[PDB]
Write a protein that binds this ligand. Structure first.
Ligand SMILES: CC(=O)OC[C@H](O)COP(=O)(O)OCC[NH3+]
Length: 19
């Protein structure tokens, strides 16, 4: 999977993976 923050405020922090 890739890491690009799937549940963040914007989408550039990356606090998790699976999307
Ligand atoms: C360090 C900074 O600017 O914070 C980045 C985001 O706002 C972090 O917010 P958050 O931790 O509530 O969401 C997680 C980001 N996917």
């Amino acid at each position: 999977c890739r890491q690009x923050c799937s549940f963040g405020p914007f989408x550039f922090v990356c606090d998790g993976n699976x999307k």
